[PDB]
Design a protein around this ligand. Structure first.
Ligand SMILES: CS(=O)(=O)c1cccc(C(=O)NC[C@@H]2CCCN2C(=O)C[C@H](N)Cc2cccc(Cl)c2)c1
Ligand SMILES: CS(=O)(=O)c1cccc(C(=O)NC[C@@H]2CCCN2C(=O)C[C@H](N)Cc2cccc(Cl)c2)c1
Ligand SMILES: *[C@@H]1O[C@H](CO)[C@@H](O)[C@H](O)[C@H]1NC(C)=O
Ligand SMILES: *[C@@H]1O[C@H](CO)[C@@H](O)[C@H](O)[C@H]1NC(C)=O
Ligand SMILES: *[C@@H]1O[C@H](CO)[C@@H](O)[C@H](O)[C@H]1NC(C)=O
Ligand SMILES: *[C@@H]1O[C@H](CO)[C@@H](O)[C@H](O)[C@H]1NC(C)=O
Ligand SMILES: *[C@@H]1O[C@H](CO)[C@@H](O)[C@H](O)[C@H]1NC(C)=O
Ligand SMILES: *[C@@H]1O[C@H](CO)[C@@H](O)[C@H](O)[C@H]1NC(C)=O
Ligand SMILES: *[C@H]1O[C@H](CO)[C@@H](O)[C@H](O)[C@H]1NC(C)=O
Ligand SMILES: *[C@H]1O[C@H](CO)[C@@H](O)[C@H](O)[C@H]1NC(C)=O
Lengths: 728, 728
């Protein structure tokens, strides 16, 4: 008998996973922060030296939050006064420090309250955003150039995304795209004039006499959407006498015919951009290829180069149409696309020509394209052993598509079943990283022969640390439902005895393209529930789930809140018939989309579940945002899909909550799933006479991720599950 | 053997108190609604006539909420389309019904969305406020004259109170005061231009996509207040050709020197109004007498006539300076004033003479002057048997002040110890209203020889019904605290065995001038908690409580959240020492001020309470409204009382909540004690890692009085207390 993995261990971070975060700066070199010094490494030989000592900024006088070194290694960007906005957005103060003359820059500094900064991908050019306007510096010590004058808070965004495009489209605040040369700056402009605003209260510190009101431009399903415009600046033709001239590239004629989004920007060469556009009805997309006319100074998008991506079964792309990956000369590219059978695979496109050629096939899916050389394409997929929750790096010979080599499958087959990768420029070297089912492993490889050079980080210290803990095990398997294989995991208590009966918590998310049953090693709340409290934490991947074909993923099209809910219950039904699960003690919990499913399941009247927790749930799809909702639900009108918008609320199931113990939790400053959603749920339960448990977390957003609130929510939830399960 | 008083019985109102609401229309007649028919009654002989049948208004098209007949019995106002605003404020539609014509007047109607309406005290003149402006109708079928033109929503208020004035000062929406003749119309005007707005979300029906933001001008402790003006209109000189000319009465010079309030308006005779003003520091009150002039058509407020009312131990009045009761000629008046020994008694003022004379004295207080003739003044007081929580009607011979008759003491000593009264015009007849400790009893009397005429309602249908149920009993007594007497009450379970041990709930309000120990009979939550649950529910009036002189009441001056808290702990401590209360199971709950005292108690670390409930609590005095807070705390500035503003918050006691089980409950649409207050408590508890229980009520205000919310909250609090006491 040794110690168990405690709630305090999870919350206070007793056991930390080591990472190896490297930064490629050429084809054979990367940077890596050892302790606090920045060291430069040589990939081929493994030797290293100091780039920057831990003590270079001892008398800097600001809490340094992050850094970015310019491509040529001449300058360092320092980031302080970090203030978070949304998921990816923030403002900060910046400073530039010259690395050849060991001093700070004091002339013409970057402003306080900068929204976004980026180096040109070669050299030391700078682009930044301040008060919704784009500025450019050629030299760090020289005056910046004003590119746009239209910027205005909460209305016009130049070079930065608005709320919905940050969250749902680009997963970034940035709307800036340097050409590989650095010559051009491509950027987007967003117009949020007619976009309705979400208003909620923010209470701030005690000293604040009256509560503040937060106003965010946020389009709920069906409302008016932000418009978009695309521009390109020639940065080499900038002067301080004349104002900057930007060239506008307009959307294809088949997009201008209605409401539409800009969903992708990928530069092909020094003189060619690829843009993908999406129709407001997200089942139709057009890739447009645009070339720079040297003589005119203009950009042309020839109709001959237009490529359509469509779906008759659902929406385009997993969450959006995939990125292209161009060959060097920019005359051809590779792209993941759904094939005839609905499985996602690499297609070979030729710029001027029709159709495409699939270079992979099979009842599995390519997860991403990672690297391109003249001889090989490198991609991550889930082929190995027909395991959709597994991931390995593969490589295809471009002169013969039949020659496909797995590069990560047989390296550590017992510890490593889930990889990602980071390739150097020109793809000479790659860092492989596995994240389960054992402890994370970081290694360096070489593209010439795929020789394994170095172990970078093996989490050895953590190994010996957890050997003294009563750690839980993970079980990955599948069940049959209507002749189809659906996968689940269970987090299993230590000294698991199949002849004893354990209570079961169902961990749910089950949104479109989700995956909750995989091979990743996690140290979480579920880790504690299994190790200390001896509760089996199960997870299931039903209809609407990802990486197993459009038949499974598109089952939920226009029908959210149906099959993903039904299959959760059928999974719990099958788990309950198993000999080691106590059918008197089954619970369900979920966050975000998972809190919506949880509540739907609890209000279903199935009788399978004793209790459940829903954290920051969606309640009614008309409350959530346009880009996410409409992807799967259409418009909420009589002509379109109003009937199922109204069939699928938590509120309409209120009466069935009499049969269960319910815990509802929401942060009051939640800008994503607004408090409104839970507020509406509770009203319907109160109006119908159902007793339940509530918890609001004031000033917390969707993550509820302030250290104190984080600790408080998991503590509150732990007490609820233990009392639900008659555990002292 | 019998059934018990259940939660259902309370929540669903199974056992109902019968009432007798009457309206004196003359010196010998009253109106009364008997089975939806309005009847007129003769007081002396008891006969009746039907004024208006239930069948009339069968084809009206709208549900009638209220009615208001002319003083001359010629017209009836019909209130419909009722929409509640705050405690007293509301908006409605009105239809006039001509009686001699037996038809509704069809033109020149009172508009929809009318804010306030009144008849004149005699005749059928009408005054109404619509859109914040006053209008007057001389005849019901005639066009209305516009009186004010400056009314603007949330900014200028003519004839109606804004938020603070409605809640704290007048306890009315009306700021309209008719002359007894009906000649003059006096009104106030409020200017909220500079008053900060409190904003909170309103979610509405599930069909509302975007939440509504509610904005109310609400001055918090130390913020800018409304300014006020007083005007008087001559209703008899109104013209079609010219606008009405109002005459202004300016506040006294001692009030105009700083921030002040209008606190009282009382017409003395047909040509005399008395006003009372109050300094913002509610230490200093002035009464002003104003005479009309036949020639100039002006008013005069002679400085020699001004009476000043001060306090050095605290504030003036119980909540505001008390109203004057004038004699018929209006040359003299009577007013409840705090005496030299701290006890509130009646004072006789003569208009041209400087000082007043005390008519009553002793260690008790007058509750209210009720009626006046040439021969007698009638008042309610708590003198009888020395019980402060008892209420009785008394009679003072004006020629001999020592001749004081109790009129209600002996009517039924076992059943009746708490009286209120309603007097006919010229006090020819009075209705007495008994409230406890037995069942309520409504009687009619003649003033001539104080003869009992008739029993109007005796609630014997409730009495037969209550014989079938296991009813709890009340205990009214005192305990000793630092050599002074302090009163408490206990609701004790049926078949109370003093050798047994019972869990105890401390029911607290403890606001300045509160009384929670009295003789009245109540059917409430406590009734059910004793009868079914066998919980002793106790209440206690410590320092700061009313009706026992200024020594006890002003003990809390400038120091809210100190002595009223300690005395609740000390009382509870003494309650435990008793052999029938179990010291391991003591709870505390409160609403409003009571939630705050509860919160302060649980965070005191006294270790006397196991658990508690706070419902819509204050948490910091800066969050509450100026008029109320500043009355007892002064201003929150360094120069004044900021020290004890900061010392007396719930938030600073957060750590101590580790020892107790806490339950926090607030309505989201609380315009009175803003959700902000609870929101700050919860955050503080999280900030130091204290687990606790929470509940929000969507769209509920301070009352949480919607049928389903009412049922839900009490159901929820029952479950929290049952489990705290190990009660199955
Ligand atoms: C189970 S899982 O581990 O597979 C899992 C869980 C959570 C998210 C993902 C995911 O793939 N995200 C990526 C995609 C594309 C870019 C942005 N994005 C979103 O999904 C953003 C949505 N607005 C998220 C969201 C937030 C609040 C309410 C809802 Cl209903 C949805 C996967
Ligand atoms: C225990 S008790 O039975 O003695 C008891 C309990 C509650 C109220 C009273 C009372 O006398 N009310 C009348 C007085 C005068 C006019 C208005 N008024 C107020 O008190 C208005 C305040 N805004 C009420 C309030 C609301 C929210 C928070 C606080 Cl701290 C205070 C008595
Ligand atoms: C590695 O060693 C070689 C040979 O001495 C040297 O030239 C190179 O700069 C070194 N690189 C690093 C990153 O230390
Ligand atoms: C940012 O604000 C700081 C502190 O007020 C000030 O020293 C500095 O001048 C500001 N930065 C710039 C470059 O304007
Ligand atoms: C933003 O959009 C509105 C129309 O919704 C338009 O009037 C305005 O000019 C636009 N602003 C810019 C700079 O495009
Ligand atoms: C009571 O009866 C008397 C005598 O007939 C009558 O004059 C009076 O109007 C009656 N009062 C009422 C209100 O019916
Ligand atoms: C008042 O409102 C009613 C709705 O019941 C409407 O029919 C009427 O025209 C309005 N105006 C009047 C007559 O005051
Ligand atoms: C209300 O007060 C403001 C100053 O706060 C003043 O300018 C305005 O004229 C006033 N309005 C009226 C009609 O009293
Ligand atoms: C530069 O041009 C923009 C509009 O394109 C204008 O707002 C700005 O004033 C110009 N600067 C000057 C004066 O050259
Ligand atoms: C109206 O009065 C009649 C006769 O007195 C009575 O029976 C009936 O219950 C009343 N109806 C209503 C609507 O109260």
């Amino acid at each position: 008998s040794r110690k168990t993995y405690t709630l305090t261990d999870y919350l206070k971070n007793t056991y930390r996973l080591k990472l190896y975060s490297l930064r490629w700066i050429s084809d054979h070199e990367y940077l890596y922060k050892q302790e606090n010094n920045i060291l430069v490494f040589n990939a081929e030989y493994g030797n290293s030296s100091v780039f920057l000592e831990n003590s270079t900024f001892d008398e800097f006088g600001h809490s340094i939050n992050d850094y970015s070194i310019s491509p040529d290694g001449q300058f360092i960007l320092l980031e302080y006064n970090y203030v978070k906005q949304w998921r990816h957005s923030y403002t900060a103060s910046y400073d530039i420090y010259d690395l050849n003359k060991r001093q700070l820059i004091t002339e013409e500094r970057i402003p306080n309250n900068t929204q976004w900064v980026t180096w040109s991908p070669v050299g030391h050019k700078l682009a930044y955003v301040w008060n919704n306007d784009i500025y450019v510096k050629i030299e760090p010590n020289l005056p910046s150039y004003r590119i746009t004058w239209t910027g205005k808070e909460d209305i016009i965004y130049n070079g930065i995304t608005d709320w919905v495009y940050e969250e749902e489209v680009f997963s970034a605040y940035s709307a800036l795209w340097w050409s590989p040369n650095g010559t051009f700056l491509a950027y987007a402009q967003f117009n949020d004039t007619e976009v309705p605003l979400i208003e909620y209260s923010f209470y701030s510190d005690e000293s604040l006499q009256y509560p503040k009101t937060v106003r965010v431009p946020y389009p709920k399903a069906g409302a008016v959407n932000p418009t978009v415009k695309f521009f390109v600046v020639n940065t080499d033709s900038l002067s301080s006498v004349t104002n900057a001239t930007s060239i506008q590239i307009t959307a294809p004629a088949s997009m201008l015919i209605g409401d539409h989004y800009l969903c992708d920007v990928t530069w092909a060469t020094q003189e060619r951009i690829s843009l993908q556009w999406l129709r407001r009805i997200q089942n139709y997309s057009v890739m447009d290829i645009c070339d720079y006319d040297e003589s005119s100074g203009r950009w042309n998008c020839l109709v001959a180069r237009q490529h359509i991506e469509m779906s008759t079964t659902g929406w385009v792309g997993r969450f959006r149409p995939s990125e292209p990956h161009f060959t060097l000369d920019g005359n051809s590219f590779y792209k993941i696309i759904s094939n005839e059978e609905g499985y996602r695979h690499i297609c070979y496109f030729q710029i001027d020509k029709k159709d495409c050629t699939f270079i992979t096939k099979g009842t599995w899916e390519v997860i991403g394209i990672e690297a391109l050389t003249s001889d090989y394409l490198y991609y991550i997929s889930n082929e190995y052993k027909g395991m959709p929750g597994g991931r390995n790096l593969y490589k295809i010979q471009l002169s013969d598509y039949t020659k496909v080599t797995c590069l990560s499958c047989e390296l550590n087959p017992e510890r490593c079943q889930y990889y990602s990768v980071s390739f150097s420029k020109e793809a000479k070297y790659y860092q492989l990283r596995c994240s389960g089912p054992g402890l994370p492993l970081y290694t360096l490889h070489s593209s010439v022969n795929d020789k394994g050079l170095r172990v970078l980080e093996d989490n050895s210290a953590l190994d010996k640390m957890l050997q003294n803990v009563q750690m839980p095990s993970k079980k990955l398997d599948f069940i049959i439902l209507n002749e189809t294989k659906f996968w689940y995991q269970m987090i299993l208590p230590p000294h698991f005895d199949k002849s004893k009966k354990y209570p079961l918590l169902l961990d749910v998310y089950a949104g479109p393209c989700s995956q909750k049953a995989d091979t990743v090693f996690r140290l979480n709340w579920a880790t504690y529930l299994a190790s200390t409290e001896n509760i089996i934490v199960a997870s299931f991947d039903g209809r609407g789930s990802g990486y197993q074909g459009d038949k499974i993923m598109h089952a939920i099209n226009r029908r959210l809140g149906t099959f993903e809910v039904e299959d959760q219950i059928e999974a719990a039904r099958q788990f309950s018939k198993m000999g080691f699960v106590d059918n008197k003690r089954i619970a369900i919990w979920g966050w975000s989309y998972g809190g919506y499913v949880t509540s739907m399941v609890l209000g279903s009247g199935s009788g399978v579940f004793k209790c459940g927790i829903a954290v920051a749930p969606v309640s009614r799809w008309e409350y959530y945002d346009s880009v996410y909702t409409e992807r799967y639900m259409g418009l909420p009108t009589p002509e379109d899909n109003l009937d199922h918008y109204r069939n699928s609320t938590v509120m309409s199931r209120a009466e069935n909550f009499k049969q269960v113990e319910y815990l509802l939790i929401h942060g009051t400053a939640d800008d994503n799933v607004h408090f409104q959603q839970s507020a509406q749920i509770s009203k319907a339960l109160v109006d119908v006479g159902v007793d339940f448990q509530a918890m609001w977390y004031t000033d917390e957003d969707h993550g509820i991720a302030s250290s104190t609130a984080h600790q408080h929510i998991y503590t509150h939830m732990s007490h609820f599950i233990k009392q639900c399960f008659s555990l002292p």
